[PDB]
């Protein structure tokens, strides 16, 4: 349908659609054979050797183009067979384009965009511009002249440099002033680029290895999109470029990227243009369209043709979508324009085409070409209109397999890149130097690219304007409005001169970047660490692979980032029936060295990213995981972007005295325009993050993918150096294929990348969320603050007019402006990988915290990256076993002060907010404590703010708005109680607040007290948070606190419970107080099913047994406490059998021994398991006398199935089988300790307390009982 004829190059000229034609030219040119494939479109199967007369030869120029790939073949397209093929290829690709909805539609838009007329020195007349036509030589020798939208030519010298070109003018900028001009696309369908992907691995697992081929239909689309902008005269000025910093050692020596090009690629590249600049352009071309409307309007005459003025006026109406009235006058409708322009600029885009063809394509212009390939799409066995390369019902139909240059190699011939590998380079040295290819360096966009008007204040009226993202659905609603006929006519025009004089539109100006350029640096950089991984490439037999560079200085210069284990293994020295081998075993190490994985925002960390690239920042050595937790994604970045959110311009509202309606209208406008404003700022930050951060991460991502490739090649090579010294013989006797060894390691490498991608995805979002967005959210909250005052002052001053609605509105205003407009990445980004990363990032409330204190690598740090500073008092004490546990004593140097960053805090942050922590409050011992409320967490500036405080049997939360008065919520517990859930045991506190409602205090996930705070405040938000015993009048007192958190919202019930389970550390067992259960440490035992009893032994040895006897004492201090005695019975010590753990913590599923102290002598707790029946009575046996008796115990903290539990001790026989959990038999007699499998069968069917429910109780100063 799109091209109605087949053509053959040999078909004879006919004057109509096969003709020798002439073109605009500087001086004289000779005619060339062209074929009119469609109304207004011609093809000239001929190398372009005449549009640019300052390129004579088709040879590589003396000084090389600054492009990563280039290809010269001065004999290409020199014969007729080639010319025929070309014609056929180009036809095929138009058919491929026109067969897609978006294609059918671009091309209709192209045929429709006749270049304007244009010429006319006279205001009143319309004349054709000559450069927008060709002269068509007829069979008889005469010539007709013909208008022309677009022409495809063969390419110039650099075959793969595909361009849109036009002929210019003395004065008019035809491609930028709405007029448009004929477009000449230099193109070939006989070649294509190679690029690499490392992203589809996460959707497409068994995928490729090497390069992939750009589908040439996409390349031709790219060019037609350009042609589209230039035919409607809306191309962006080429002086308008995305300027890059260039002076730093790591920065790309140089790189032109024009805004026109960014626009044309679309997808995430189009998002580098900020809203301000985007709007500037839309307004500019809107006004250029107006000037065309007003040119048409003055037109009373029309020369050089037999068509009517009206007819021609009507062609341009349809092109520009003008509105005509009854009087014949024309005008541009802002709405119809906005849509047209959107379509041309935001819909017609390369990224959108990729969606329609379903091809793999570079994803951003920054993903550079790496190769060039000869192809041949004409035969259907190679390439169809419908599938391109990826042919249905074949091996090629699957994972973009058709475009994999390895798999479909019968279809892509590798060609020479005429750009040297170090043609363009910087030279990095260390105070050894290495040339580094310019296209391997970082993109650093200058801050000048990023402009906004966020600082400008705005006046809101009742008039004020209320606005008003590109899915496939939206594209469909455009398609459905199209009119797919009334094609613009071919019309007679009067002969131009036989030689049409014209010069190509003159472009800049632009300059050879200085070529490297030495840099003396102090550290080895990641490029050095990357060059070390390379070799050599090479022959004999070197490749002594090793760590610690200088490797560099060989070869074998061959650095690796595993582990002599590996360097040693594959630097032998191995043959030959032990090849095989060796081989088997290296396929293993690789997939354990590379699939290797290991904080709650960056879940998955790959710890060899450090070593491979030396990250980066890169001073070491390789606990890159340590440094990552300590500092967050910022250690990856090569440069730290600046986040420059200015004080936002505020709104002032216009009053409409005595006017109810305009006064409410103006409120509504104020609020909606606010909603716009968050959007504006969010959008700004995302744009910033995309250009400066997410690009650094994607480079690193590719560099990893390469590092892996580097290692698998070095390994493959060292194998063959061996297998070759051989057989050989047999040799013909272990018929092994590197081609299947390759297959095995790529599967491996892809698996690694699924992890690495994921890890780096999370690094990207986490930086966005915790180091960029917050700076915005603060300026946004001050903006609200100030809008709220204004709006309430407005509602107050016009209360006369608003008699019936002063509440409804104040409530509307207070409800609206008290609530954060949530950030949704999907609003700003189209890209499902980042979107799903972000959804998972949000899923965890902790990532949203504004303070997240944790002990990591030897300091207490804020993991949310909001604390400006954390001052730790000299006499604070961190539990040597779990340094997250912090002891603060009643000394003034036992304090910790946290200070939030000024640029991130706002006055209203404690209006809906929450805090959680765990605390261990020792028992109160002394009477002075009976009436002594003391502070322990204090956030108060001159009387206002919040604090957490303690008194006898109480935890107190207190808010004080704004210079008095208070509100207060309280949790109360008794010290006259047998066994307390609370006294001296770790408890989980959460305080939530909602200014318009009430504060709530929760304890271990349970709501205790809530109380209205709607009578306040406001609260003065303090910079400081002091952790300190303040006012405690017991000299000897202290508290333990840990896992402090602060949140900027009010947590619901469910959130609070999840948070409780997440911080419970359920992989680890705990003693009675809540501290980690430890090895080699005495514990008194409390059975939870009979807690008024304790353990004893009637007799040592197999004759004796252990039993529960009662009662336990009491312990008391008159008027202060009365509790069951807990330091009773025979003590238990848990001993190591199996381990790992360098450490002393008893973990879930550890296999242990249980010793039992009797009279200061330890015995082994054991039993005869073949004793008849389910219950096996336990005994205390002499340590060296256990014989083959059952003694190994599996410590448990959860069941299965995951439900946590208090049944700690599953005893096992010496074959590995369950005997039973340890509990007690009775109700019979005599409360012996037994192991019973009955217990194992209950725990799976219920979580109730059972006879096997134990708690271990160590001595603790906070309990104070005296043994």
């Amino acid at each position: 349908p799109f091209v109605n004829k087949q053509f053959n190059y040999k078909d004879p000229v006919n004057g109509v659609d096969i003709a020798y034609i002439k073109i605009p030219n500087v001086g004289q040119m000779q005619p060339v054979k062209a074929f009119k494939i469609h109304n207004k479109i011609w093809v000239i199967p001929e190398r372009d050797t005449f549009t640019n007369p300052e390129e004579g030869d088709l040879n590589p120029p003396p000084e090389a183009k600054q492009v990563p790939v280039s290809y010269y073949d001065s004999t290409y397209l020199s014969t007729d067979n080639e010319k025929d093929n070309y014609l056929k290829g180009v036809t095929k690709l138009f058919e491929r384009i026109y067969s897609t909805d978006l294609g059918r539609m671009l091309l209709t838009s192209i045929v429709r965009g006749i270049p304007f007329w244009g010429g006319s020195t006279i205001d009143t007349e319309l004349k054709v511009i000559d450069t927008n036509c060709i002269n068509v030589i007829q069979p008889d020798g005469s010539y007709r002249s013909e208008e022309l939208n677009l022409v495809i030519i063969g390419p110039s010298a650099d075959i793969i440099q595909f361009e849109c070109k036009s002929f210019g003018h003395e004065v008019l900028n035809l491609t930028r002033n709405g007029y448009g001009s004929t477009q000449y696309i230099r193109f070939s369908p006989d070649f294509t680029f190679g690029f690499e992907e490392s992203l589809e691995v996460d959707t497409n697992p068994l995928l490729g290895a090497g390069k992939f081929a750009t589908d040439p239909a996409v390349t031709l689309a790219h060019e037609l999109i350009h042609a589209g902008h230039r035919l409607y005269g809306i191309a962006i000025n080429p002086n308008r470029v995305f300027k890059v910093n260039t002076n730093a050692y790591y920065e790309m020596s140089g790189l032109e990227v024009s805004f026109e090009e960014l626009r044309t690629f679309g997808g995430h590249d189009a998002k580098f243009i900020d809203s301000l600049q985007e709007n500037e352009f839309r307004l500019y071309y809107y006004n250029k369209f107006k000037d065309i409307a007003s040119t048409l309007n003055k037109a009373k005459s029309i020369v050089g043709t037999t068509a009517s003025l009206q007819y021609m006026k009507n062609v341009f109406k349809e092109k520009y979508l003008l509105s005509e009235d009854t009087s014949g006058k024309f005008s541009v409708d802002k709405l119809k324009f906005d849509k047209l322009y959107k379509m041309l600029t935001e819909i017609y885009t390369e990224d959108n085409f990729v969606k329609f063809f379903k091809v793999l394509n570079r994803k951003t212009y920054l993903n550079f070409d790496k190769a060039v390939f000869k192809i041949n799409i004409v035969p259907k066995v190679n390439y169809t209109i419908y599938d391109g390369f990826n042919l249905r019902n074949t091996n090629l139909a699957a994972n973009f397999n058709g475009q994999n240059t390895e798999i479909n190699n019968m279809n892509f011939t590798k060609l020479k890149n005429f750009t040297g590998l170090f043609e363009f380079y910087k030279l990095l040295c260390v105070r050894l130097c290495i040339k580094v290819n310019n296209w391997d360096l970082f993109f650093s966009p200058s801050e000048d690219n990023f402009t906004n008007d966020l600082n400008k204040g705005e006046e809101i009226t009742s008039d004020t304007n209320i606005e008003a993202n590109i899915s496939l659905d939206l594209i469909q609603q455009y398609y459905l409005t199209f009119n797919f006929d009334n094609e613009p006519e071919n019309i007679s025009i009067e002969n131009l001169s036989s030689d049409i004089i014209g010069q190509l539109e003159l472009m800049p100006n632009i300059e050879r970047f200085p070529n490297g350029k030495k840099y003396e640096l102090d550290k080895y950089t990641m490029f050095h660490y990357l060059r070390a991984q390379e070799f050599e490439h090479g022959k004999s037999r070197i490749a002594l692979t090793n760590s610690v560079n200088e490797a560099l200085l060989n070869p074998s210069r061959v650095y690796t980032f595993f582990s002599s284990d590996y360097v040693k293994k594959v630097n032998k020295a191995t043959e030959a029936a032990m090849f095989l081998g060796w081989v088997e075993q290296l396929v293993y190490d690789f997939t354990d060295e590379t699939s290797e994985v290991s904080i709650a925002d960056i879940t998955i960390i790959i710890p060899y990213i450090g070593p491979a690239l030396n990250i980066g920042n890169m001073l070491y050595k390789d606990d890159f995981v340590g440094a990552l937790i300590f500092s967050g994604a910022v250690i990856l970045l090569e440069f730290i972007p600046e986040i420059a959110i200015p004080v936002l311009g505020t709104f002032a509202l216009v009053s409409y005295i005595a006017n109810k309606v305009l006064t409410v209208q103006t409120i509504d406008n104020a609020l909606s325009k606010r909603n716009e404003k968050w959007d504006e700022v969010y959008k700004y930050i995302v744009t910033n993050w995309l250009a400066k951060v997410n690009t650094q991460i994607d480079l690193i991502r590719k560099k990893m993918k390469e590092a892996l490739e580097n290692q698998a090649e070095a390994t493959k090579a060292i194998i063959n150096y061996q297998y070759n010294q051989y057989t050989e013989e047999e040799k013909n006797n272990i018929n092994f294929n590197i081609d299947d060894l390759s297959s095995k390691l790529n599967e491996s490498i892809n698996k690694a990348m699924i992890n690495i991608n994921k890890f780096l995805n999370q690094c990207s979002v986490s930086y966005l969320m915790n180091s960029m967005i917050p700076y915005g959210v603060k300026r946004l909250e001050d903006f609200d603050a100030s809008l709220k005052d204004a709006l309430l002052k407005y509602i107050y001053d016009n209360r006369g007019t608003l008699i019936g609605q002063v509440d409804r509105l104040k409530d509307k205003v207070n409800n609206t402006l008290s609530t954060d407009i949530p950030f949704q990445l999907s609003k700003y980004v189209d890209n499902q990988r980042l979107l799903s990363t972000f959804t998972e990032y949000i899923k965890n409330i902790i990532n949203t915290s504004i303070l997240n204190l944790r002990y990591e690598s030897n300091h207490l740090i804020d993991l949310s990256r909001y604390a400006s500073k954390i001052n730790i008092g000299s006499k604070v004490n961190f539990d040597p076993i779990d340094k997250n546990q912090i002891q603060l004593f009643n000394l003034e140097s036992s304090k910790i002060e946290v200070i939030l960053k000024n640029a991130i805090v706002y006055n209203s942050m404690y209006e809906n907010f929450s805090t959680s922590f765990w605390i261990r409050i020792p028992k109160y011992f002394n009477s002075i404590s009976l009436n002594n409320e003391y502070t322990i967490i204090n956030c108060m500036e001159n009387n206002s703010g919040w604090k957490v405080s303690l008194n006898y049997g109480e935890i107190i939360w207190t808010l004080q708005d704004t210079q008095e008065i208070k509100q207060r919520v309280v949790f109360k517990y008794s010290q006259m109680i047998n066994i307390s859930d609370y006294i001296n045991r770790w408890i989980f506190v959460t305080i939530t607040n909602n200014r318009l409602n009430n504060s709530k205090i929760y304890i271990n996930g349970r709501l205790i007290d809530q109380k209205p705070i709607s009578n306040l405040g406001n609260i003065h938000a303090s910079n400081n948070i002091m952790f300190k015993l303040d006012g405690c009048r017991d000299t000897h007192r202290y508290i333990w606190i840990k896992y402090f958190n602060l949140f900027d919202k009010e947590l619901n019930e469910k959130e609070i419970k999840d948070l409780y389970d997440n911080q419970s550390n359920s992989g680890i067992l705990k003693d009675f107080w809540g501290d980690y259960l430890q090895y080699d440490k005495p514990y008194y035992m409390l059975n939870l099913y009979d807690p008024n009893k304790y353990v004893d032994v009637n007799n040592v040895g197999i004759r004796g047994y252990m039993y529960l006897k009662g009662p336990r004492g009491s312990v008391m201090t008159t008027n202060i406490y009365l509790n069951s005695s807990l330091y009773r019975g025979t003590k238990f010590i848990i001993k190591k059998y199996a381990s790992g753990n360098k450490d002393n913590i008893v973990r879930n599923n550890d296999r242990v021994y249980i010793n039992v102290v009797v009279k200061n002598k330890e015995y082994r707790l054991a039993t005869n398991a073949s004793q008849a029946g389910v219950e096996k009575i336990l005994s205390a046996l002499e340590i060296p006398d256990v014989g083959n008796l059952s003694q190994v115990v599996v410590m448990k903290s959860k069941n299965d199935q995951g439900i946590t539990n208090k049944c700690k001790m599953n005893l096992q026989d010496n074959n590995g089988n369950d005997i039973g959990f340890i509990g007690f038999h009775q109700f019979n007699n005599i409360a012996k300790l037994v192991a019973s499998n009955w217990y194992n069968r209950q725990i799976e069917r219920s979580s109730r307390t059972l006879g096997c429910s134990w708690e271990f109780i160590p001595v603790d100063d906070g309990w104070g009982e005296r043994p």
Partner: antibody
Amino acid sequence: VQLQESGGGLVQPGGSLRLSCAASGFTFKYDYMYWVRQAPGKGLEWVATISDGGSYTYYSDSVEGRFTTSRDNSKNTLYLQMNSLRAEDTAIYYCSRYRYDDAMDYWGQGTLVTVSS
Amino acid sequence: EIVLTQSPATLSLSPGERATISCRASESVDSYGHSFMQWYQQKPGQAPRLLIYRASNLEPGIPARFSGSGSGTDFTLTISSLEPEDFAVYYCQQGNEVPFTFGQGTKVEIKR
């Protein structure tokens, strides 16, 4: 490592006086400091304690409202402002360091306060 | 106010004999697993000297003949084998809570 306490002397009933214990040779600014007194040929009596930062003070009920203890961590010095003195305040006055969390381990020589017309 | 009754009030004993002075609290003197009873020795014209702290801990620099014991409300300082250098007034002192308080004194006189 010693404490020299000065300020002692004769003073009229109802009058006033200020003692100054001068610490050297150890980390004053971290230690609670106590004032203790002993009327001639009689028992030891605790007067007052002051926390390391100087923010929290304790007084024996006999001298409450009437004596004030302060400190200056920068000049390693401890102070006892002493007002509306009575006959029964006649005593030798000792400052001592409290070694947390044990006992008062270092003491000065004392200084004699005599209250009489 | 915790009152510490110390006895015997006077004690006269030959060198090399055992001295057992005994202190008794009106209320308990224990908290946080400790008993904050201290024992001091004062000689005429000298500041009191720490002997024993938290009930049972000998102060470094003080010789072994001094031991301390007890808990709760009843504490005891014994001098294992007296010297003539030990004529002093010995004081118990609580540190458990404010008001921190002293015993009334016990006068070891030496016999010859």
